[PDB]
Ligand binder design. Sequence first.
Ligand SMILES: *[C@@H]1O[C@H](CO)[C@@H](O[C@@H]2O[C@H](CO)[C@@H](O[C@@H]3O[C@H](CO)[C@@H](O)[C@H](O)[C@@H]3O)[C@H](O)[C@H]2NC(C)=O)[C@H](O)[C@H]1NC(C)=O
Ligand SMILES: *[C@@H]1O[C@H](CO)[C@@H](O[C@@H]2O[C@H](CO)[C@@H](O[C@@H]3O[C@H](CO)[C@@H](O)[C@H](O)[C@@H]3O)[C@H](O)[C@H]2NC(C)=O)[C@H](O)[C@H]1NC(C)=O
Ligand SMILES: *[C@@H]1O[C@H](CO)[C@@H](O[C@@H]2O[C@H](CO)[C@@H](O)[C@H](O)[C@H]2NC(C)=O)[C@H](O)[C@H]1NC(C)=O
Ligand code: NAG
Lengths: 147, 97, 44, 46
Amino acid sequence: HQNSEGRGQAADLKSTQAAIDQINGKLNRLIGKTNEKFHQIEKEFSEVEGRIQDLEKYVEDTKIDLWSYNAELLVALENQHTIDLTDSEMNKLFEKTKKQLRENAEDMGNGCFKIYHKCDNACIGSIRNGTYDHDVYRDEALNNRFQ
Amino acid sequence: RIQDLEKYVEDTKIDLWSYNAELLVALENQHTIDLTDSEMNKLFEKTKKQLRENAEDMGNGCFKIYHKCDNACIGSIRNGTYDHDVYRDEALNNRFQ
Amino acid sequence: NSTATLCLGHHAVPNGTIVKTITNDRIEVTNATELVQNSSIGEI
Amino acid sequence: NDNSTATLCLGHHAVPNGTIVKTITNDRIEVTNATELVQNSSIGEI
Ligand SMILES: *[C@@H]1O[C@H](CO)[C@@H](O[C@@H]2O[C@H](CO)[C@@H](O[C@@H]3O[C@H](CO)[C@@H](O)[C@H](O)[C@@H]3O)[C@H](O)[C@H]2NC(C)=O)[C@H](O)[C@H]1NC(C)=O
Ligand SMILES: *[C@@H]1O[C@H](CO)[C@@H](O[C@@H]2O[C@H](CO)[C@@H](O[C@@H]3O[C@H](CO)[C@@H](O)[C@H](O)[C@@H]3O)[C@H](O)[C@H]2NC(C)=O)[C@H](O)[C@H]1NC(C)=O
Ligand SMILES: *[C@@H]1O[C@H](CO)[C@@H](O[C@@H]2O[C@H](CO)[C@@H](O)[C@H](O)[C@H]2NC(C)=O)[C@H](O)[C@H]1NC(C)=O
Ligand SMILES: *[C@@H]1O[C@H](CO)[C@@H](O)[C@H](O)[C@H]1NC(C)=O
């Protein structure tokens, strides 16, 4: 923010934590998923056996392909969701702020609000902490809006 | 040898189907959740764009209609026939003072 | 100078059911159906 | 800024040297940080 009292910036733990909470946890679906597999068929061969070896190769091969595709699709999906998740959590933060300001400001379009009254660092905290009552500054702000 | 392979087949099949199953449920659920929320989040927009400038978003998912609204206008919004222009002068004067 | 408030909302139920999605493993929904046949009849 | 106004911006995190990942839309997109899901290497002993 930039008001008459000067400049400054501070984080919002409430929404940021909601982003980490969904990532750390989406990992827990993927990190420890490993499942045991004991004594499968031999995927490697020394001599040439013909029909049986052709099948034993065709099995372990076609298994690998399907899992590789399944893997690629899973990453590309969890990525597209991870990108969309993070964007939404801040895009929510913008709306949560806008609904708080009521008529006392305007969307500049640069991802910033132009608050149309004298705001100290005190009122900035009431926005951040979430206690901003628009009704007091409403009369004060509306006159600045129209000129 | 044969029994080892015949087992390795039907097993590897089951694993691949189960992953496909788990992934399918978790996707159609996450899509179902987003769907139901969006369909209602749309109705709010349908109402706000219908009310024009005769109200304000209170933030709690309710509109504060800044004019006298009888049971007629409530049904007119219910219908989709709410004309903003009639109440505008009445409401617009109340918002700004 | 009389006002009126119009609010919007959605369905809700007391005892729901939990399902698993991409974001979270536990989430309560209104209504859900089972996709796995875990039992059978005793005869063919 | 005029002492009768006030300017409030909100934003998100960023980092200098990030990493490229693949999604559905695009093959290249830079994210803040990421981990590799494929164990490409191993130890020399059993
Ligand atoms: C919102 O939509 C509803 C649904 O159509 C409208 O209700 C309808 O209102 C009309 C006019 O009042 C009703 O017709 C009238 O019936 C009375 C019966 O006493 C009759 O005396 C009149 O000559 C006329 O025929 C109509 O019955 C009623 N809907 C139904 C299903 O019966 C309502 O008018 C709409 N909102 C507004 C603000 O108009
Ligand atoms: C909650 O979700 C379940 C699952 O979708 C709903 O159960 C389904 O309900 C419908 C209608 O109540 C059932 O259709 C009926 O099927 C019977 C026999 O199959 C048939 O005789 C009827 O004429 C009608 O077609 C459906 O079978 C049933 N189950 C499934 C798996 O779809 C339930 O209705 C939902 N509850 C609410 C309140 O939405
Ligand atoms: C990217 O950031 C994450 C944190 O969200 C890192 O995850 C680390 O490793 C495990 C989780 O898998 C935990 O010890 C912590 O959550 C993280 N620790 C630290 C020190 O970051 C992940 O390692 C990071 N990736 C890179 C390449 O730095
Ligand atoms: C908490 O909110 C109060 C107003 O209710 C504010 O004065 C205070 O600065 C806030 N504290 C923070 C943001 O740490």
